[PDB]
Amino acid sequence: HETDEEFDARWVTYFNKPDIDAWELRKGMNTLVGYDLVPEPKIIDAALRACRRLNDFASAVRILEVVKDKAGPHKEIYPYVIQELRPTLNELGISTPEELGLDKV
Amino acid sequence: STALAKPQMRGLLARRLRFHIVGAFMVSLGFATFYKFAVAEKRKKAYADFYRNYDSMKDFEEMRKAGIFQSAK
Amino acid sequence: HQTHAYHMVNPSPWPLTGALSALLMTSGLTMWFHFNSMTLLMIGLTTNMLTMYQWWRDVIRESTFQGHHTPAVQKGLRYGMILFIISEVLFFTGFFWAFYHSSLAPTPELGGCWPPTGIHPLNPLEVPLLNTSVLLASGVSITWAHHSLMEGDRKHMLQALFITITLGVYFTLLQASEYYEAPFTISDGVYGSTFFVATGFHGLHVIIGSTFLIVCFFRQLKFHFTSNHHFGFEAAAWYWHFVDVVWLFLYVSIYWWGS
Amino acid sequence: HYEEGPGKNIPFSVENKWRLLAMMTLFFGSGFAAPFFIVRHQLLKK
Amino acid sequence: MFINRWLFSTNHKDIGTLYLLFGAWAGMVGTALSLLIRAELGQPGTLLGDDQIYNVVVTAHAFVMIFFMVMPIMIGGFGNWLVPLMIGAPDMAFPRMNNMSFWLLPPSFLLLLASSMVEAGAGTGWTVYPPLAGNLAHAGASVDLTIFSLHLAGVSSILGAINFITTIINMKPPAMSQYQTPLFVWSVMITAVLLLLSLPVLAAGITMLLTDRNLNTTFFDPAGGGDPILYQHLFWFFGHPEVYILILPGFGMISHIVTYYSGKKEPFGYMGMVWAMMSIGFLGFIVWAHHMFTVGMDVDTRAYFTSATMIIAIPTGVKVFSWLATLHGGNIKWSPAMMWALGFIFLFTVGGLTGIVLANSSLDIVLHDTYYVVAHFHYVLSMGAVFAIMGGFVHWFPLFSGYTLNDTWAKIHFAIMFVGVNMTFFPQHFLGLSGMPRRYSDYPDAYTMWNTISSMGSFISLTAVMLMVFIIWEAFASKREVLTVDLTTTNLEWLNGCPPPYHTFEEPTYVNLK
Amino acid sequence: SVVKSEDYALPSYVDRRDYPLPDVAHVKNLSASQKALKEKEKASWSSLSIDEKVELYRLKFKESFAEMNRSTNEWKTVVGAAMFFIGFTALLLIWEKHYVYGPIPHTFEEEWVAKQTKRMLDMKVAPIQGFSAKWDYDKNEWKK
Amino acid sequence: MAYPMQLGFQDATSPIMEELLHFHDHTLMIVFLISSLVLYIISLMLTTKLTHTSTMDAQEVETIWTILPAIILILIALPSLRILYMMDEINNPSLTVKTMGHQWYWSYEYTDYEDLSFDSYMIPTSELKPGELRLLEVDNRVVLPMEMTIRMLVSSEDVLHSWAVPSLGLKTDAIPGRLNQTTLMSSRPGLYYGQCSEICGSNHSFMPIVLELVPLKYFEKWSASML
Amino acid sequence: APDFHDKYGNAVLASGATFCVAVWVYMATQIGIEWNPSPVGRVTPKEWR
Amino acid sequence: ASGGGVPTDEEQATGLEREVMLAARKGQDPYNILAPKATSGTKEDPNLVPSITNKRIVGCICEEDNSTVIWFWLHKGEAQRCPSCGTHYKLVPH
Amino acid sequence: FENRVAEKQKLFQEDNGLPVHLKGGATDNILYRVTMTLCLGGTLYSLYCLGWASFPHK
Amino acid sequence: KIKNYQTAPFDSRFPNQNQTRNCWQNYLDFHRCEKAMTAKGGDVSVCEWYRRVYKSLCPISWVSTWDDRRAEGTFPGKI
Amino acid sequence: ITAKPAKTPTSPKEQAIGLSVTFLSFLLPAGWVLYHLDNYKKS
Amino acid sequence: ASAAKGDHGGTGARTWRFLTFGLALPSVALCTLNSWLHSGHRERPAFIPYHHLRIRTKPFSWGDGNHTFFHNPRVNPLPTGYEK
Ligand SMILES: CCCCCCCCCCCCCCCCCC(=O)OCC(COC(=O)CCCCCCCCCCCCCCCCC)OC(=O)CCCCCCCCCCCCCCCCC
Ligand code: HEA
Ligand SMILES: CCCCC/C=C\C/C=C\C/C=C\C/C=C\CCCC(=O)O[C@H](COC(=O)CCCCCCCCCCCCCCCCC)COP(=O)(O)OCCN
Ligand SMILES: CCCCCCCCCCO[C@@H]1O[C@H](CO)[C@@H](O[C@H]2O[C@H](CO)[C@@H](O)[C@H](O)[C@H]2O)[C@H](O)[C@H]1O
Ligand code: CUA
Ligand SMILES: [Cu+2]
Ligand SMILES: [Mg+2]
Ligand code: NA
Ligand SMILES: [Zn+2]
């Protein structure tokens, strides 16, 4: 019932659709976070670039927050994902929640 | 300087469940052994030890001498 | 304004008057059994009949006269009547259980036999057999009435339904006579107890079912039923077949096997 | 037709919270007190 | 307008509201009776009187808690409010007959109060066994008033069962099959089938008791060839189904609550949950004589009833594990309703397991008619049926009223009740194992410690009950109006707002068949 | 901003960590400067300041994840108040003992209990485990 | 009899009561295990921020959830039914004693040979001799020979009662018009207490049972002296 | 801004616990409740006959 | 053997019963007795949801045999999508 | 008999706001008042009888 | 003839907890036997086994009531 | 769930009044009966 | 058996009328004949005051308390025997 790689590839393809609309962005992220996994950086990268095509900076930040949330107590996952995404963050000018102060309670 | 290693990212909930259900089973076995020893077997031994050399007439005579009976003085 | 097919019933006082009638009938029975008085009971019986009359009157107003019985509504009433009959079957089942319990294990006080010492049962081949043929025949005539109605035949519906009612009344009169003539009574131990309580509740249901058929008879006289829409008639026919089947079980169990 | 909305779909008023407290006090208090007064009734009989 | 609306109702929400108010008042009566029981037992000696006044209190306690509190709240209250909304129906099938099911209950309760006021009351046990309940050992009107109270409650519930079955079968959207209706709706349908089949048999048995008391029949009197044990069979043929009637709507509410506060769109294993409730309902008709293991039945009959009773653990275990599997992976919201439901899962399991102990007829010889039975059934009733009622009440109060409770107060309430019921009933296991009988106003001295603790626990529960009244008052006093409710896509009863309009689904939902 | 009762049938905002992108924006109406900010968002986000990025976030969302997931001191109130009411219950029990309960039976007097204990040992109540098993019949004392 | 703060069963006085103790220990171990496992799994489900809220397939796991409880039920039923049929097995009694329940006391009849019968009433609390047990002593005890298989027949001359002696694992309902049989065998001499175990009216709490188990020769002489 | 629990939670917890312990200890020990504990290790058996 | 005299529904049905009868003859279902058949549900071919007002609740059985129904208000205007499966619905008021 | 159902349909569909239990006219109101009077009066009488039966009588 | 009676033995006709019919049957048998003997000219001593069994098993009040009803002519069993 | 602030806020003092009244409504009538039990029993 | 009739082709009122007049009512007529050939008193048995019959644990709520509801003096003895 489909490899990890086939799953990730379906999701990359989903977010990479050039004319993806706002509804499809939200549907995708809200569906994805129901699964027992933290999404691979390559999925998050495609979702963040969808945010860019949709001119939605806030949803890009929210997506980074939900990556951290899905890792639960595994505190090593989120800094790894951010590390892997730094080229995309720099290219698109996406500030992390931490850089925006949005990790303060 | 250094980069971070890729950690496990998928199936973390399922992994947690499997590990602890297995641990629950091991503890359940540990408990069953403790209970057989501390309760079930203890009771069998107490009853077997009590009756092994039990003298019902001697028991009766002790009770009779203590005055407990209507039918035996 | 609705765009479903179901019936939003006008606010109605009959649920409250019916509930109070139940209070008056039960506290009335208590007053009769323990305080030598029938007053409360008579009030409760009266308000009960008034409640039933006006409630079912209104159902006729809602359906024949106002058109609220769409097919969806009629289908619900079919389920309601079937479920009601099922609950009545289970009520009688308790009395059959009592009968078999006592007759299959007759205790020493009875003589350790069934029928008990000193009980002389009715001959099941005399009036009980007659009553059996009467209710079976009425199940045939009500079926004729049903088909006449569906075929649009007013005169033969009325004839068949009248014959059905007459047979119901014949059964009731025969049973009343058998009650008077019986040499045993309800106080004649568990034989009399099971016999009269079980056949007595059955006789009450025969009277109820006969009344329902009579309601249908007068509604038919007044042209309420169409050849396709006549659930009150169907419900009365189902109830009547239920009363016939309960009789057949009573006949086989108490009158024949229990003799 | 009927009143709709919060505080309107109930057979008791909630327009004044202190009148409501009184009504709730009588309502639940009377249910709780009844068995005690029935016991008192039965004790005072014989 | 007030009389038209509240005495002449044909509206499923208003009638549900009437049932909730009635059940809440009954709950106070039942609580007071439970406190009188535990006051009598809270120190050795006699407080109130001999076993007659004591067992009138015990008997009324049970009837009030069962017939006037649990059944009206679960079936008449939550059932009427929620079932039509959960299937998009505009009301019940028979909305005027529905009002008579409600209005039969105040007269039923009046008859029960009358039974306790006349003569010396009905000190019979809620089972009303003859000959103690017959016209020599209970001469006078009390037992007949009890019988008539049960007749009216029985008619009320039989007609209600007819209404719910018809509504649930006939009034769903045309595209919705029975396997697309929520589990609470299933739980009510199955409860209604149990009511339909079981209450007429009770009606038959208590009518025979009435005629033995007043018409000189002898169904249960050996002098006429009758048998006291026949009454027990007829009673328990109803009475075992009755305990499944008491818990099944609770199971339905627990499924909804656990799903909702887990953040899930659906319960785990829906068709297994349907199967399990149907299986429990079916098995619940073939086990009744485990209430009669000491009456002198043949050994093979005892073996059958032991075995059939134990089978019930299998579908029930599927439900427990499926609730756990619904929690699994949830975004857990630690609401007060969730706390009630979590307490339910655990404490219902404990009580169901002591029920499996009792199912063993050999052990039941020593446990029958002792406090081990009392401990068992209050785990499933005071910590199961009641916890589901409290969870459902806290969860749906904002739907019914349009106002929110104070959640901190509701959690305080849960905490107090949890301590109180466990302090009340846990020690009763020890009293039962060590031989304290049921229906006693006083006990040999050795039993004093656990009776003292149990009575102290009952007073903690009293404090929780009083606090519940205050909490409901505070909510209506402060008038915090609901705004947004999450998860409406899988909880249709919320989608018409809080409270929903008097008429809902005047235009039915659109559901296509595809 | 302001959510109204009459809005219950419209798509609504929620902060929930498993529904990260709600069905509507937290803020629907934009001032002149907020409109200009949404225009600027169409250009490179590197040219937005930190404050502008925060303002865009707070137009879209009400609470951050860290805010919506924060813990509270509520448990102290709950536990403390529960213990208060449990303590209040003991006042009721004290009242009951003082004004409702009379003397317990004379069989609880110390001398009665001492004699009854001896008689239970004389009839060897529970001699395998429960009671007399704990008495040393040879040394005439409770087993240590 | 029960003793203060008792948690479990009274000590066994008959072999069948000993069987019941071991069977209860077995079943209670299972009850504890299952309850503890459910409580533990609850806590496990509730203690992680990890989530998985999409649809979960149930088919696989429900095999475990039904087959394992079925096995456990069979492991309870086997020893349960063994004891049940052991209880029922023919034993050939040496003695038959009848007891009739009444409001509110028990009568006893020993009519194998002579017409011996007497009434047995609770000792009132005000008349207890020092060291006697409140609500449990009777004026006339049910004297019986120890180490012998005895047939008890139980009935009632009024309402239901039930004749119970927990030490011996006995409870038999007392039903008018019915003669119920049970067997009793005490491994030891002594005094074994029980209490009426079917609600029977005003003094249901106050009609106890006291068996006095002694050697046959003492029982015989007691019997003769009770004529 | 601090809520009720930030402001008062510590006091509620401490006062509630102190009150609860004190009044239950008083009830359990000072008002003549007979708990009827086991005589084992506690009662000196005394001649009765 | 066989006269007449029993009214037909055509002659005597009235009120809502008669409205349902007459509409069924025309193949119309104004009182929602039948389940609507789905379209492909694309944005191009949305399910058309009649209403006598400007919003109606839709229940979406996203896949055949799902036990979970997904419920939402459909409002007049641009087609909306089921939040679970995305199938499109458009309100056709009046 | 002749079929007068159409007449009754017109009467019970008249747009007069009356609930169905009163819509036949003045006789409905009379029968309703009789029923409700017997019910409420009988219920008060039953409460009196409870009162009487709740106490012993010499 | 084969005495040493202690109590009534197990009887396969009545193997269950309810022993009512065992008492009843032996009461009937004894009295049937006694009727046959007192008449035709034999000794009631051949009835003795039934006498011992019913006396062992039957509650005194049952025997007493049955005896009274035989004297009254209201005993419902066949003797 | 979300909700509006209270339309008619119930202050801590008002809650203390409502709680006290509620508790007294249960406790006073039962307490009166239980206090007078002996008065009833011997009469 | 399963009887011995015939019929069908399309069910109807005519067939059920045929059954009503051709089978059902003739059967009632036959049983009415049979029943009234066997009617008239049979002799009432000796009165015996059996204790399982003529039960009185509470007076009946009508009459003198001692008569059943459909008491027939000819065949229903009182606890003390037949009435004069
Ligand atoms: C389960 C209900 C939840 C609340 C429970 C509250 C109760 C507190 C315990 C909190 C923990 C309760 C767990 C069970 C304690 C068993 C005590 C016992 O010695 O039982 C012994 C037997 C009889 O045994 C014997 O014949 C040999 C006795 C040897 C005695 C030596 C001295 C022992 C210490 C004496 C003092 C104990 C006093 C206990 C006094 C307790 C008063 C309240 O009695 C029985 O069968 C009792 C039958 C109980 C059947 C229900 C099982 C529920 C299990 C819950 C599992 C999860 C854990 C909950 C963990 C907590 C989850 C929240
Ligand atoms: C809500 C009410 C309720 C419910 C649901 C139940 C549920 C059960 N009850 Fe209980 N019971 C009562 C209320 C209830 N009972 C009452 C009121 C009485 C006394 C009546 C009176 O005399 O007044 C009583 C009496 C009673 C008796 C008679 C005892 C006696 O009088 O001597 C018995 C006997 O078998 C019994 C058994 C059971 C069983 C087997 C269940 C089963 O349905 C329980 C099934 C649940 C589980 C087993 C737990 C969950 C399962 C798992 C986690 C799976 C794994 C488990 C195993 C492998 C064992 N009950
Ligand atoms: C073809 C005849 C049809 C029956 C009509 C007779 C009136 C009875 C009305 C209801 C019948 C239903 C069963 C009631 C129980 C007993 C009546 C049994 C049938 C009957 O009529 O039995 C008669 C006795 O009636 C009696 O005691 C008492 C009769 C008067 C008391 C009526 C019953 C009072 C109790 C009613 C309880 C109702 C409980 C209903 C619960 C429903 C479910 C909630 C028999 O007469 P008999 O002189 O003993 O013997 C004949 C000797 N020649
Ligand atoms: C299980 C449910 C009940 C739980 C416990 C109830 C707790 C009691 C609350 C107070 O109840 C009151 O207590 C008073 C005593 O404190 C009683 O006054 C009585 O005693 C007073 C002081 O001795 C006199 O002044 C009064 O006249 C006299 O009525 C009074 O009547 C009663 O209402
Ligand atoms: Cu005798 Cu209880
Ligand atoms: Cu049961
Ligand atoms: Mg019992
Ligand atoms: Na007491
Ligand atoms: Zn969908």
Coordinates of C-alpha atoms in Angstrom, one line a residue, chain C residues 32-34 36 109-110 116-120 123 125-127 129-130 133-134 137 139-141 143-144 147-148 151 156 159 163 167 170 174 179-189, chain M residues 11-14 16-17 19-21 24-25 27-29 31-32 34-36 38-39 41-42 45 50 52-56 58-62 68-77:
Chain C
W32 CA -61.8 0.3 44.7
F33 CA -59.6 -2.5 45.9
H34 CA -58.8 -0.9 49.3
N36 CA -64.5 0.4 48.9
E109 CA -51.4 -28.9 46.4
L110 CA -53.0 -29.6 43.0
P116 CA -55.8 -30.2 39.2
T117 CA -57.9 -32.4 41.3
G118 CA -61.4 -31.0 41.5
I119 CA -61.1 -29.1 38.2
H120 CA -63.5 -30.1 35.5
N123 CA -65.1 -29.6 26.6
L125 CA -65.0 -29.6 21.2
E126 CA -68.1 -27.6 22.2
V127 CA -68.2 -23.8 22.6
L129 CA -64.3 -25.1 19.0
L130 CA -67.2 -22.9 18.0
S133 CA -64.4 -21.4 13.9
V134 CA -66.0 -17.9 14.6
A137 CA -64.2 -17.2 9.8
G139 CA -60.3 -13.6 9.5
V140 CA -61.6 -14.7 6.1
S141 CA -64.4 -12.1 6.0
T143 CA -59.8 -10.3 4.1
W144 CA -62.8 -10.2 1.8
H147 CA -60.0 -6.8 -1.1
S148 CA -63.4 -5.2 -1.7
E151 CA -61.2 -3.0 -5.7
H156 CA -69.2 -5.5 -0.4
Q159 CA -71.0 -6.3 3.9
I163 CA -70.0 -9.8 8.9
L167 CA -68.6 -12.6 14.3
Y170 CA -70.7 -13.6 18.5
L174 CA -70.3 -16.9 23.5
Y179 CA -67.7 -17.5 31.7
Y180 CA -71.1 -17.6 33.4
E181 CA -71.5 -21.4 32.9
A182 CA -67.9 -22.4 33.8
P183 CA -68.0 -24.5 37.1
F184 CA -64.5 -23.2 38.0
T185 CA -63.7 -19.6 38.8
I186 CA -60.7 -17.3 38.9
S187 CA -60.3 -18.2 42.5
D188 CA -59.9 -21.9 41.7
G189 CA -56.2 -22.0 42.1
Chain M
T11 CA -56.1 -12.6 -6.2
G12 CA -59.4 -10.9 -5.3
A13 CA -62.5 -9.9 -3.4
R14 CA -64.5 -12.5 -5.4
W16 CA -62.4 -14.2 -0.5
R17 CA -66.2 -13.8 -0.6
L19 CA -64.3 -18.5 0.9
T20 CA -66.4 -16.5 3.4
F21 CA -69.7 -18.0 2.3
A24 CA -66.0 -20.1 6.6
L25 CA -69.6 -19.5 7.5
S27 CA -68.0 -24.2 9.3
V28 CA -69.4 -21.8 11.8
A29 CA -72.9 -23.2 11.1
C31 CA -69.9 -25.9 14.9
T32 CA -73.0 -24.0 16.0
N34 CA -72.5 -29.4 17.1
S35 CA -72.4 -27.0 20.1
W36 CA -76.0 -26.8 20.6
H38 CA -74.3 -30.9 23.4
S39 CA -75.6 -28.1 25.6
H41 CA -76.8 -28.8 32.2
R42 CA -74.4 -31.6 33.1
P45 CA -70.1 -32.9 41.2
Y50 CA -60.3 -28.6 48.5
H52 CA -56.4 -25.3 46.5
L53 CA -59.8 -24.1 45.2
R54 CA -62.2 -21.4 46.2
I55 CA -59.2 -19.3 47.3
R56 CA -60.0 -16.4 49.6
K58 CA -58.7 -11.1 50.4
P59 CA -62.5 -10.3 50.0
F60 CA -63.5 -9.5 46.5
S61 CA -64.2 -5.8 46.0
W62 CA -67.8 -6.3 45.2
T68 CA -66.7 -14.4 42.2
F69 CA -67.5 -11.8 39.5
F70 CA -69.5 -14.2 37.3
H71 CA -70.7 -16.4 40.1
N72 CA -73.2 -19.0 38.9
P73 CA -75.1 -20.5 41.9
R74 CA -75.9 -23.6 40.0
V75 CA -72.2 -24.6 39.4
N76 CA -69.9 -22.4 41.5
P77 CA -69.9 -23.5 45.2

